[model samples]
Target chain A: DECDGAIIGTAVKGHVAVHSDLSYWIESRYNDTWKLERAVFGEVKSCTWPETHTLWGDDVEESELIIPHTIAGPKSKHNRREGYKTQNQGPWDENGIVLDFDYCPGTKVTITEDCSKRGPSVRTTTDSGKLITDWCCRSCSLPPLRFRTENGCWYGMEIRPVMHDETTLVRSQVDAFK
Target chain B: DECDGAIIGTAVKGHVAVHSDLSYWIESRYNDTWKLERAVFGEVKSCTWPETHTLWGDDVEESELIIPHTIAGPKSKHNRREGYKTQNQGPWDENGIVLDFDYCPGTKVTITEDCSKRGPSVRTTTDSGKLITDWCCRSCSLPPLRFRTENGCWYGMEIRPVMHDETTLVRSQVDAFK
Candidate 1:
C-alpha cells in the first residue's frame, strides 16, 4: 500500500520440483519479460531457455497443469525421515507458483542452481538501480520443468505443483510375511 | 474437440489440494453454473456444499493460488519408495488447478460428502437429463483453497502446492514413505 508508485516489491519469487518422470521444476524470480499469461494444470515445457519463451502443454490452449500420479506407501508419514525433512527453505516443501513481478531493482535474482547442465540465473534491474537486464533465467533444474506471474501482484500465496508416489512397498502384510 | 454443440465434454474435471496449514481442497466436477473467471492461486472463497468452505491466509488477493514453501529433505528421493508411491488415483498425488466451465449436461454431480457438519452435494442437469440445480458442490476438505481455468488448458504436468514438513508426518510416513 505504498502510495503513488506502489508495487511494494517481491513480485514473483519461486521454486517447484516434480520428478521421477512426470517432468517439472520452475525455480524463478522472473528474468526477461515474464509471460505465462495462462496455464491451469500439467504439461508445461521449456527445458532450458531465454528463447521465444512460451511453453504450456497437453497440446496447449490453456488450462492443464494437473500433476497427478499418486502412490505413497512405504509407511508413508509423508515418507518419514524424522517426519520428512524440514529446516525450511522459504516456500516450505515446494512445488510451484509465484507472482507480483518486479525484480530489476538490483535484481541479482538467482534462486537456485545446482549444475549438471547449469540452470537458474538472474540479474535485471531498472527502478533506479539501473542494470536493465544482466544475465537472467531465474532458476532451472530441468527434468523437463515448468510454471508464472506479473505485477499489480497476482498468484497470491502462489506456490503450486503436485504428483505423488513416494515408492517403497511390500508390506501389504509384509507380502504375507513372505 | 467435438462440434455441433461444441465443448464436447470435460466441462470441469477436478483435483486440487493444499494443506499443511495453508488451507485448500477442491476435487470438482463443477455441479452448477460455475463462475470464477480467473484466480491463479489461493484465497478462493466459496462454491460450497462441502465441509470447510472458508479459509485464507497471508491476507489474500492477486491470484490467491500461489503454491510456495519448499523443502522435502530427509534424503529426498522425493524422499524414495518407488521414487515414492505410484498406484494411481487418476490425478495421482494431486495438487491443484482445473477450469473451463460448462457441465450441466445430464448433470447430477455431487463429488463428495462426509457429514460431521455436512460436506458434498450436487445435481444441476439440463441437456436433456433435467435436474435444474438440485444439490451441487463437487468435493471439499478445505484448508486454503484456490482456482483457475481459461480455455486453452495449460499447466503441463501441473500439480502445484507447497508448505513443507510432510503435512505433519505419517499418514504411513505418508502412505508408506511415499
Candidate 2:
C-alpha cells in the first residue's frame, strides 16, 4: 500500500478573517435630513474563522459552512439565517457567504499567527474593488459602487487558511461507545 | 476654411457641479461612548458635466468623463459655484466625486422606474447649478441614487429635465463671449 497514512476527510480550522475599514462617513439625525456627512477612518471588524465544528477527522462529509454575513443588494438575500449571533442584526436580507474550516494539523487545528489582534496598517482606501464571475475580486476596480455591505463590500474572498494533521486521526467516536 | 473654429484660451466657465447631498450612509449614528459611527454605506456626491454647446454630440472633444473618488480617505469643503462665482470660495476637498453628464439633446440622468417620484427624479431644488465639465459620458454602473434631505441611509440624484434648442446653440454667444 503506497498510502503511508490514509487520514481521509481532512479539515482545517481556527483561521482569521480581517476586514479593514476602508473609509467611513457619518449620517446624522440632523434634526431632520439624512445627510452623507463626516468621515471616520479605522478598523471595522475581525472574525475568528472555523466558527464551530460538529465533527473532526474522518467523521465529516461534503458540507458547506457559510459565514452568514449581512448583505444588501438591489433586492435579494442569500444564505438567509435569522437569530444568528452577529454584532448587528436585521437589515441583512442577503449578503454573501464565506467558507468556514477548522484548521486541523496534518488533520488537527493549529494557530499560525495572532493577526486578529493587529490593526490595519494602510492609509489610502482604494475604491475600485474587483468583480469576477460568481464573485468579485477585491483587487478588481469597481465602478462608482454598485452595492456595499458592512462586511467590507465583500467583493470577493481569499483562500482559506488552515493546515491539517496527517497522523492517526483517532476520531473520538462518542456514539461508538454508546 | 474647414478648420476655422477658434481655440483661444479663455476662462473656463467652470466645472459643472451640483449641490448634492454628498455625505450619506446606509445606517449609522453617534454618541459620547459610541462617539461617531460611519454609515454602512459611505458618503456620496454628484457631478454633472457642463453643456457649453452640444452633448454626446460631435462638438465636444471627448465622450465619457472619469472622475476620481476615494473612500475612508481625507476630505475637505468646497465652493459650489460656477464661472465668476467660483472666484471667491475655494474648491471642495471631497473624499470622492460623483460623475454625471448631459447629452446635447438629453441629460445623463436615469429614473428609478418603480420608485416613481420617491426615487431619483431631478427636481428643482436650487435656482442654478454650475456645469463643472463639458458634455460627457459617465462611464459608471452605480446609478444616481435619490439623495433626499431625510433620515435614511440612501442617496440618489436626478437631472432637471431640460429641452435643448439645437438652433440657438449653433448661434449662441456663450462660447464667443467666453
Candidate 3:
C-alpha cells in the first residue's frame, strides 16, 4: 500500500522537474559574463531521478535535468544546454546548488521588485530592472518564480525573466497540446 | 646632561617627521574622491613628537605632523591640511592608522613600479600611469618613497600619487631650505 503511494508521489515530482531545470538555467546566467547572450525559452529537454526502493519519505536521492538555451553573441555559437544536479530529489526550498555565477561587474544587473500583476512580482533589467525575489516559507506551497505561456491557455510552467543587456526577456514554452 | 641629548634627538626626530606627515597625507588621498585636486608640495609646516624621558630606546611615545594640499575642483574652495597621529612615534614601519579611503571605484588607481632612477621606486598614475609600491624590509633603512623636489634639491617629502578619475597627479612638498 505504501509503495503505491510512493509511485504516485514520484509521478508528481516529475512535472516540477521542469522548474528545477528552469531555475538553475536562469541562475547560471546571473554569474555568466555573457549573460545577455543567453536565451533559454524552450521546453524541458530531459529529466532524471533514481527509482525509490524504501518507504521513508525522509530518504533523499539525487536528481538532474537539462534544457536548451541559445547564446546570442558568443560561446562559438554553440547550442548551449545547461543542467543542474541536486543532492536530493527535492522540493528545493531547503537547497541551492552552486554550478556557476559571476561576481561584481563594472556594469550591473539591476534586480528590482514589482508584484503588481502577480502576487509575488519581480523583474530584472540590466540598466533598469524591476525585480524582487519573493519570500515564502516552505510548504506554503508556492513557487518562488513561475512560468506561464503568454496566452495562459497552455498547461505549463511559469515564465523565466531572462536577463538581457538592454533588459527585455521573459520566455516560456508553448504547450502545443493546449 | 641627558636632557640635552633628548633635545637634539627630538630635533632630528622632527625633520624625519616631515616624512611621517607625508606618508599619512599621501595615504589619505587614496580614499579621497577628489584626490586629483590634492597637491601638497611646498615645505614642512609643522612636525611634533614626544620628549624622551629615558635613555632606553625601548621607551616610546606618540607623534604627529600636518601638511597642506589643494583640491583641483571641489570642496568649496577650502585649503585642506591633513595630519596623522601614531601611537608609538618614530620610524613608522609597523604603523598604519585608519583615516579615510574609499573602496572600489569604477575606474582604478593604476599602481605600478619603476626603479630606473632610484631603487625601490614607485609611481601612482591613473588611467595609464606607470606606478608601483616598492618593498624593503624595515631597518634596511630606506624610506618606502622619498620626496625630493624636481631639481633634486630644495629638500622635501616624497610625492603622493593622488588618484584621479582620468588619472594624473603626484603631490610633493617643495623645500626652500635646500
Candidates 1 and 2 compared: the better one by lDDT is 1
lDDT of 1 by residue, A17-79 (tens): 111112122212123332222222222222222112212222422111222111111111111
**Candidate 2 lDDT for residue A144:** 11
lDDT of each: 0.20, 0.19, 0.20
The segments of candidate 1 whose C-alpha lies over 4 angstroms from its true place after superposition are A1-35, A38-96, A99-118, A121-178, B1-40, B47-49, B52-178
**lDDT per residue as tens, model 3, A9-104:** 111231111111211222122233311111122122222322242121243221212121111111111112222221111111111111112211
True contacts kept of 2: 0.04
Interface RMSD (Å), every candidate: 15.6, 19.3, 29.1
Residues A44-73 of candidate 2 have per-residue lDDT tens digits of 222221212112213321111112222111
- Ordering by TM-score: 2, 1, 3
Q: How well is candidate 1 docked (DockQ)?
A: 0.03
Which should have the higher DockQ, number 1 or number 3?
A: 1
List ranges where model 2 is wrong by over 4 Å.
A1-20, A23-87, A93-178, B1-158, B162-178
Using TM-score as the measure, the top candidate is: 2
RMSD of 1: 23.8
